[PDB]
Amino acid sequence: ECKGFGKSCVPGKNECCSGYACNSRDKWCKVLL
Questions:
Q1: Residue 14's CB: how many other CB atoms inside 10 A?
Q2: Cα–Cα distance measured from residue 15 to residue 24, given in angstroms and rounded to the nearest whole number
Q3: Nearest in space to 8 (alpha carbons), one of 30, 31, 28
Q4: Is the dihedral of CA 32, 18, 26, 12 positive or negative?
């Protein structure tokens, strides 16, 4: 139940799936590397 990639999410509590993190440019799931 998390965000994979290119999915609107909330940065701060890390709601994205393991490996992906929320960014502040598109406010969605984005891979770290």
A1: 13
A2: 14
A3: 28
A4: negative
Measured distance CA(17)–CA(30) in Å, rounded: 10
Q: Which domain holds residue 1?
A: 1-33
- CB 3, CB 16: distance < 8 Å: yes
**Domains held by the chain: number:** 1
Q: Which residue has the tokens 């990639």?
A: 5
- 23, amino acid identity: N
Q: Is the dihedral of CA 23, 28, 29, 31 positive or negative?
A: negative
Which residue, chain included where needed, has tokens 């994979």? 4
